[PDB]
Amino acid sequence: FSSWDHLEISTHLIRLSEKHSDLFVPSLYTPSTCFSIERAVLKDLHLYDSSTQSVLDHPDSTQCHHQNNYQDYPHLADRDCQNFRIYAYPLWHHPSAHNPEEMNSMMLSTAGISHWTLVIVNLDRREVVFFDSLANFINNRLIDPALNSIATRLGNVYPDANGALSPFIVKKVIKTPIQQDSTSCGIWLSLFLDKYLDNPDYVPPLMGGRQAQYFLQEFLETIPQRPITQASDCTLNVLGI
Ligand SMILES: [Zn+2]
Numbered sequence: 034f035s036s037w038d039h040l041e042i043s044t045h046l047i048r049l050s051e052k053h054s055d056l057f058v059p060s061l062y063t064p065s066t067c068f069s070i071e072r073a074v075l076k077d078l079h080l081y082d083s084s085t086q087s088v089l090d091h092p093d094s095t096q097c098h099h100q101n102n103y104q105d106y107p108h109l110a111d112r113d114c115q116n117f118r119i120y121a122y123p124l125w126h127h128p129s130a131h132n133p134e135e136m137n138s139m140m141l142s143t144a145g146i147s148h149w150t151l152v153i154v155n156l157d158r159r160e161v162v163f164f165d166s167l168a169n170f171i172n173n174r175l176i177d178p179a180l181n182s183i184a185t186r187l188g189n190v191y192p193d194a195n196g197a198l199s200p201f202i203v204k205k206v207i208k209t210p211i212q213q214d215s216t217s218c219g220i221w222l223s224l225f226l227d228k229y230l231d232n233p234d235y236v237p238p239l240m241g242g243r244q245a246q247y248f249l250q251e252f253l254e255t256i257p258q259r260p261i262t263q264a265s266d267c268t269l270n271v272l273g274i
Pocket of ligand 1: 077079097098099100114115
């Protein structure tokens with residue numbers, strides 16, 4: 034398997050967004066990291082005021098950075114950026130980075146050095162789903178505060194059925210590694226999102242090594258029958274297509 038880089042992963046997200054109109058695809062230019070994912074989610078839900086540098090208690094559409102932005106969001110130029118329900122973020126990690134400056138410098142240079150995972154925010158199900166094909170590649174000390182802080186902040190905005198502001202549930206769905214090589218993480222998380230969007234209770238099967246390879250190959254072999262057809266020339270250019 035040729036690995037999938039940020040552009041290949043983003044291409045699959047755009048492909049999925051053509052099938053699932055509720056799916057928000059984040060920046061095509063900057064992947065998220067454990068240090069930046071909460072800020073990215075809050076800004077995409079219009080819950081962040083860059084002028085006070087403050088989290089908002091309710092969305093404020095005047096804070097929107099999705100319009101007229103053809104570097105990060107050419108695919109949102111003609112959408113209502115508010116109208117989405119499922120937000121899926123490719124998340125880049127390297128274990129040698131211990132602060133945002135280190136993680137960012139490393140990411141900017143590279144995004145077998147990269148590891149890719151996925152954070153999904155599902156507003157309808159009040160859940161934050163974290164997918165890592167290697168299960169625990171990211172130290173809990175780094176990923177858990179981010180997942181739980183997002184869950185807590187979004188619970189205060191999207192109430193539960195009891196009328197309470199309970200945190201969204203966090204689901205770290207892979208307990209046993211499914212990935213068998215050093216390079217296929219981007220393909221795995223793309224397959225996961227594909228299946229999740231048809232069934233949010235989906236969890237990939239535990240497979241032998243050879244079976245997993247055949248499984249991934251089967252997924253890859255669908256891709257040529259699934260061209261992107263609704264994207265603007267600007268979006269296609271950013272995707273490197
Ligand atoms: Zn917006």
